């Protein structure tokens, strides 16, 4: 990415990029990278040959200063994360001068620095704080607050990247998807607001599995029970979100599973009428 951003017209960005090249390329990590990377047949070797803590993060305003200030928000998040002692790798510490002027770098390295910080977390000290802050951010987004889609899509990308990270302890992909203590219904609704139907459906399934596991361990459960429990606790009905996902995705026969053709609520009846192209009764239903 540094090589890609080194060839732009702006001079500050390329100066920062070459300084980063000189910094990381002079470390032992750069030497090990060169030793591993010398065997491949890539002209990048020719290109790069000549170049050879919790107090500062707890702030409700710092996490959501989103009033047409997405770039400032990501920049200040990156600065506050790098200045803390959580970061350990030199390459994850010396990127400050360049990321301050490049907007896309902050977005593309925020999940990397988050994962690096959570790797060295002890006794879930950082895990709980980050989970609470991310949950608060999602709740703020769900407020009726009119935030630009860039923040939600960046957070969805971060969550998707963190879902693919292997847990240091023994576990499965189910434990991998729960790197942070979150309920995925809110993230699914956010993805629905961003037209990310597949990710929203996956997150809804993950949340349903988590609720089922929690109920099973509490005892040691139909779709309507889960929907009413989500409405009571979270405030958002899971059944309606699943119906919206199955309708907007265009799948032929998927809305009937969530209650299509068997739900007394007028909304489901209207959705079924639209899906089955029964416009004659649909118009009567809308008027009625």
């Amino acid at each position: 990415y540094l090589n890609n951003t080194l060839v732009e017209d702006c001079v500050k960005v390329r100066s920062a990029a070459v300084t980063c090249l000189k910094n990381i390329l002079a470390t032992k990590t750069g030497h090990s990278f060169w030793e591993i990377y010398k065997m491949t047949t890539d002209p990048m070797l020719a290109y790069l040959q000549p170049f050879r803590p919790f107090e500062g993060l707890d702030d409700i305003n710092l996490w959501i200063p989103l009033s047409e200030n997405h770039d400032i928000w990501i920049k200040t998040l990156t600065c506050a994360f790098l200045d803390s002692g959580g970061t350990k790798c030199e390459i994850l510490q010396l990127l400050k001068p360049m990321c301050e002027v490049k907007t896309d770098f902050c977005q593309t390295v925020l999940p990397y620095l988050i994962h690096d910080i959570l790797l060295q977390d002890t006794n879930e000290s950082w895990r709980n704080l980050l989970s609470t802050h991310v949950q608060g951010f999602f709740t703020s987004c769900l407020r009726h607050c009119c935030l630009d889609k860039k923040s939600q899509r960046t957070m969805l990308a971060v969550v998707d990247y963190m879902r693919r990270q292997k847990r240091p302890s023994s576990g499965t992909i189910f434990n991998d998807a729960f790197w942070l203590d979150l309920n995925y219904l809110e993230v699914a609704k956010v993805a629905q607001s961003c037209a990310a139907h597949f990710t929203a459906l996956l997150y809804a399934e993950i949340y349903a599995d988590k609720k089922s596991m929690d109920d099973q361990e509490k005892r040691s459960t139909t779709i309507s029970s889960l929907s009413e429990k989500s409405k009571e606790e979270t405030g958002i009905s899971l059944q309606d979100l699943l119906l919206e996902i199955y309708r907007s995705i265009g799948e032929p026969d998927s809305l009937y599973g969530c209650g299509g053709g068997k739900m007394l609520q007028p909304i489901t009846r209207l959705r079924t009428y639209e899906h089955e192209a029964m416009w004659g009764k649909a118009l009567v239903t809308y008027d009625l």
Binding site: K262, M263, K281, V284, D287, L288
Partner: protein, 327 residues
């Protein structure tokens, strides 16, 4: 088709919208006609007044029958009786003279006039009842008289009965609107619900599904669900069955059965008879659609209904023996 002259094309469109259960759409369409067309012909003005009184559009301001009916309804809503009685008398005189001026010779032509005069008489009776006060016994006797007369109108056509039912619904809505909070309000609400369900069966027997749906919507607007489901849930299930929505009706009826058989506690014989009717309806539906083998559904529904009816037949009432015979 645009070749039809607008003199009758607009009337046909309005009639089709009325018979399709569309009220707000008809109101907006009529407002658009008023915007695009300035002058009003007698026929379209009469249809406008009919839609105004039928939809309770009190915002909109010789006189036709529908105009006189709307004026009488507005006067009744304003606690004015002199103009109300005068308007009803004028409507009666106009209808009688218009009917007798023609050559007659046809029985079928008498039916609309008879229906209009019956509506005027019903409004007169309502005004007499509401002249000074309303009591439970008076409302009960009025409702039983109306039900008896509707029984006399079983063989009549739905076209001549629909205005009567619409006027009755409007009257009950007006009484509900201007009723103080007491047990009388509950009695009027129950009477309104019963009238709406009777209208639902009346329209269902004439291959109509939009008016029963509107009646169920009004019931849901007024009545509320509870632990013990009433007969209007069963009526909604039947209406959805008539709309070729077999799955939804079956699911609703199964939910009703699950609610009834777990929280019956012999609270009311009416609940017992409606449970028996629901079981019989479910058995008939499963027999007709054949979603399951007869062996289990028969024992689950038909014998259960038979034994429920036979275990509490100590009153020998007609409303129980007819249900037992039907089961």
């Amino acid at each position: 088709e645009t070749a039809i002259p607008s003199s009758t094309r607009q009337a046909g469109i309005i009639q089709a919208l009325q018979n399709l259960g569309l009220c707000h759409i008809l109101s907006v369409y009529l407002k658009g006609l008023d915007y695009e067309n300035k002058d009003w012909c007698p026929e379209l003005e009469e249809l406008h007044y009919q839609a105004a009184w039928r939809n309770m559009q009190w915002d909109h301001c010789g006189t036709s029958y529908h105009e006189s009916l709307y004026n009488a309804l507005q006067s009744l809503r304003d606690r004015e009786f002199s103009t109300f009685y005068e308007s009803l008398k004028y409507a009666r005189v106009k209808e009688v003279e218009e009917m007798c001026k023609r050559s007659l010779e046809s029985v079928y032509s008498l039916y609309p006039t008879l229906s209009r005069l019956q509506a005027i008489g019903e409004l007169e009776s309502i005004g007499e009842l509401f002249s000074r006060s309303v009591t439970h016994r008076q409302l009960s006797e009025v409702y039983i008289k109306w039900q008896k007369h509707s029984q006399l109108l079983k063989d009549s056509d739905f076209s001549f009965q629909e205005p009567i039912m619409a006027l009755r619904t409007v009257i009950l809505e007006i009484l509900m609107e201007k009723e103080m909070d007491n047990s009388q309000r509950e009695c009027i609400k129950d009477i309104l619900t019963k009238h709406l369900v009777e209208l639902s069966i009346l329209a269902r027997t004439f291959k109509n599904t939009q008016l029963p749906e509107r009646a169920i919507f009004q019931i849901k607007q007024y009545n509320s669900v509870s632990c013990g489901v009433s007969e209007w849930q069963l009526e909604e299930a039947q209406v959805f069955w008539a709309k070729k929505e077999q799955s939804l009706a079956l699911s609703i009826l199964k939910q009703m059965i699950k609610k009834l058989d777990a929280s019956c506690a012999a609270n009311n014989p009416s609940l017992k008879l409606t449970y028996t009717e629901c079981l019989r309806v479910c058995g008939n539906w499963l027999a007709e659609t054949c979603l399951e083998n007869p062996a289990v559904i028969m024992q689950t529904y038909l014998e259960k209904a038979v034994e429920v009816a036979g275990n509490y037949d100590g009153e020998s009432s007609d409303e129980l023996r007819n249900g037992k015979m039907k089961a």
